[PDB]
Amino acid sequence: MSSIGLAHNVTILGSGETTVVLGHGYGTDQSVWKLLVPYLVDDYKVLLYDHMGAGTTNPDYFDFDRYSSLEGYSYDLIAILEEFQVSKCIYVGHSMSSMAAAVASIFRPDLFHKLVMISPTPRLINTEEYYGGFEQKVMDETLRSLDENFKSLSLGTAPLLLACDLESAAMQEYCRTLFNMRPDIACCITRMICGLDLRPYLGHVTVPCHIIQSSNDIMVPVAVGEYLRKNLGGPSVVEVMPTEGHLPHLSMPEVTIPVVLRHIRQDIT
Amino acid sequence: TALNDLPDVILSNIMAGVSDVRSRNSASLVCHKWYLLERATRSALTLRGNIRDLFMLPTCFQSTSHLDLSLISPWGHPLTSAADPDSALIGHLLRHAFPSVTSLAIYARDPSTIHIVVPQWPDLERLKLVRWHQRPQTDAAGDELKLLISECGTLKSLDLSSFYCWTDDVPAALGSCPTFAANLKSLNLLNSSFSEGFKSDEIKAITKACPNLREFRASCMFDPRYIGHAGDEALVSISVNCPKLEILHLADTNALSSARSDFDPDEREGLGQEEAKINAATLIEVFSGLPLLEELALDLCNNVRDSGPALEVLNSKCPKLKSVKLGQFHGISLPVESKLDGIALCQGLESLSIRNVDDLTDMGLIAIGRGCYRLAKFEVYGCKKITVRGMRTMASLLRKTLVDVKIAACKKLGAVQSLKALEPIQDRVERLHIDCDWDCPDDKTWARLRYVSLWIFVGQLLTPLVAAGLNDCPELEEISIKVEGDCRVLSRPTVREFGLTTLLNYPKLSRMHLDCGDINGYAHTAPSGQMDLSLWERFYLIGVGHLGLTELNYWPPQDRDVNQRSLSLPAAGLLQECNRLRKLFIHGTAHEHFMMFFLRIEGLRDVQLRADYYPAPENDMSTEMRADSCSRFEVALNRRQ
Amino acid sequence: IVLKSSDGESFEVEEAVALESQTIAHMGVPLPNVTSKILAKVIEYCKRHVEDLKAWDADFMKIDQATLFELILAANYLNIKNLLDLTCQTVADMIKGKTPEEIRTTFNIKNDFTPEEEEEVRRENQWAFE
């Protein structure tokens, strides 16, 4: 079949005129939707893909220059959607993948009908006037662990630093999956995430966005939802569910799945 | 005279004695005559390769009689896909490449694979079906196994011990053709993946359909809590229907579990601890009906009491008996004064395996040692009363023959006590299993010890092993470590490493099995203040690169709720440091980035991800494994020249 | 019964034991092939094989290449299956872990494989799990 499909492990499931595109967060793969896919195939056409950084993809295909910025991921999403004749899709994305889909909607408003976001964030690094993520001081430790791992792997030794070796107790959970790919790719993707700042660009997002957060989420502050709602250029709705952890759609499905299904099927936004 | 000048017949006789496949490959590269002789005399072949390049199959093995197709990459992938008309060519290709196959082992993922490959050899004698994935939904029962029944040949042995199906498929298939059942001499239904074992009625049907059986193994449902449990009537029917049985192995499905918590009555939440529907009189009748019995195993998870008289009848009515394995058979040996009784009267036993006997004391062990004086392999599991004195005395009694011992879960025998108790046979024991229980309260050269098996709880260190007594083992070539326990409640270990570097004490250690598959934790998301399984993988694999291992089987720990056994970054990084690995098998999943770490190993030849556990990853969207990743990894691995 | 070798050396033999060889039992005793030591060892071995169960059988093959070759070549003349087995499964144990070069060295065999032929044989051997 297509080289794009083989490169991104694209799978097409179900049937129907409406297509649902599921995008995992960084450090996981399309298998993170193993519990949501059964609830969708009976009434939606489901497209599952792995973005190029994922550990299930060929590390040779990973271009550091292309994927040092979010625009590369947005262009890859556009290319995948164009390859499979998908238009007006419903995109459900985890953290920082939904931001890539939002940028893609900025580029191609036609390809997207709505956006469902699970704990998104426009910028991950807190500033003086914006509290929507983590202090650069604590993300520096994660970057240092990734750099030490890459340095160890380059010399032929074992990369032995883990997210559980951090003392933040929230960076442990948030950065858990960043240690699930090749260390150099991990460093590149993590720096892309740290340098990301979509606050200027939120005004161009016109497609409706459905934001799903968690109650008192210790990783992504709940105020990010209100900030996004205010600064989005299209209709938006924020829902807070009683979940926890970095992967609610896999670890707590009996709570997360109904919320995602309701936001998929409700079109008012 | 030169070796090549010998007559070809005796040279072929020499070549048939070359069993190691590595040495056969070496010998095939000596000369044209040697290549021809090796290709003529190679009997067993285990096909290694990818499904994509199957049409590149070598045709030099025209004389192989045992063919094993269960390990073709991707492991467990369907060899034949029914949606493709081209799949019929695979059967012809296999028939042409290996025309003289009489024993076949194939991974029967789909019915089409069986229907296309198995009929290719009418003269097939033994068949082994392997399936760890889910059973496909069919119209009726037995349809998948009814494709086996060919009306142009005679199959003699069928092995379904690794073929997951429904327990009603087997009686349905055997009942559709009486000739096929009558031609069977061996039937291995001993699958631990059955959700429930065979019912009494199913066992009756299976035994009735197959009167000529010589070997019968089955995972039966003996628990009297469920309707249709196997009982006295089932055993009586087995004895009546198959008088010619030589091997009879019956076990409860939970008794076949890798995790001890599934069958151990101590570790079960009140499960078991209730008498099974088996009586001493019933066992007497069953043994009376089986005169040719040679190997007997009845591994139950429900107590049987006062079984001594039955085991006494065993000795008289079964003169050929050599092996006895008992599970939860109480009252096995209660000697009075100096009169032997129970299992101790079976003086012809060669191997005896005992599990969970509440009535056993030191005197029972002594009586077994004095009566079963030909015993060359003893195994005791979960006996709470036997202590070091009884075990040491029994070992001294059997000091001429005992070379295979296993002491597990015994309360009063820790590692130190077991190693002290095995003192009389220390210079003669070859295989040994002990539990790494360091907290149990209360010359030195293992000259012939070649294999050691260890069971240890999660989070326990291996370092006290050398101080326990296993110090000078000049011949130890293989050690198996099994780790079990729920680590979700444990805190971070105070010590950084498990202690695999403690195995540098043994110079000949080259093969290792590290089975951590029964560790339950959190895979990718720990809730809060918890540590995920990558920390434990690092803990249990630090220092593995220092050992000179040539072979390693590793079982990654699992998160039971998500049902995944992924390899993590520290595990792959530490396995990469094993520079002398020739074979590396990981019984779990690993994505492409971590699998590509293993290319740094210079001498690596056999690498595979074998998810031989139930249930297996169903598709590419359920785990991180991908078919393209496997193909690329194998292409790159077989490209290093 | 007394036997004689090829070079002219005459050796006595115990009876009954001689029925072990199906060729001998089937048919003084003018057998011309076994030469002294070979016949002595063969008869002595079959003698033990009437009553170290295998530890005498393993020590029994502590002889060198020449004696082992003579032993098997004449045990084929006596058609003795047990002797054939016990003997050949020593020339087989000497083809244990060893490179092709080492086998050629131990048995003085000379290579006749062109490099493409070796490439073909290695590609074929890649299809087997060792």
From Swiss-Prot, chain C:
InterPro entries: SKP1, SKP1-like, SKP1-like_dim_sf, SKP1/BTB/POZ_sf, Skp1_comp_dimer, Skp1_comp_POZ. Accumulates only in meristematic cells. Expressed in inflorescence, shoot and root apical meristems, as well as in developing organs such as gametocytes and seeds. Also detected in cortical layer and epidermis of roots, leaves, pith and vascular bundle of young stem, young floral buds and organ primordia, pollen and through the valve of siliques. Not detectable in mature root tissues. It comes from Arabidopsis thaliana. Keywords: Auxin signaling pathway, Chromosome partition, Cytoplasm, Cytoskeleton, Developmental protein, Ethylene signaling pathway, Host-virus interaction, Nucleus, Ubl conjugation pathway. Part of a SCF E3 ubiquitin ligase complex composed of SKP1, CUL1, RBX1 (RBX1A or RBX1B) and F-box proteins. Residues 72-130 are annotated as: Interaction with the F-box domain of F-box proteins. Pfam families: Skp1, Skp1_POZ. Pathway: Protein modification; protein ubiquitination. Involved in ubiquitination and subsequent proteasomal degradation of target proteins. Together with CUL1, RBX1 and a F-box protein, it forms a SCF E3 ubiquitin ligase complex. The functional specificity of this complex depends on the type of F-box protein. In the SCF complex, it serves as an adapter that links the F-box protein to CUL1. SCF(UFO) is required for vegetative and floral organ development as well as for male gametogenesis. SCF(TIR1) is involved in auxin signaling pathway. SCF(COI1) regulates responses to jasmonates. This is SKP1-like protein 1A. GO terms for biological process: auxin-activated signaling pathway; chromosome segregation; ethylene-activated signaling pathway; jasmonic acid mediated signaling pathway; microtubule cytoskeleton organization; negative regulation of DNA recombination; protein ubiquitination; response to auxin. It is found in: Nucleus; Cytoplasm, Cytoskeleton, Spindle; Cytoplasm, Cytoskeleton, Phragmoplast. GO terms for cellular component: cytosol; mitochondrion; nucleus; phragmoplast; SCF ubiquitin ligase complex; spindle. It comes from the Eukaryota. Its main location: nucleus. Belongs to the SKP1 family.
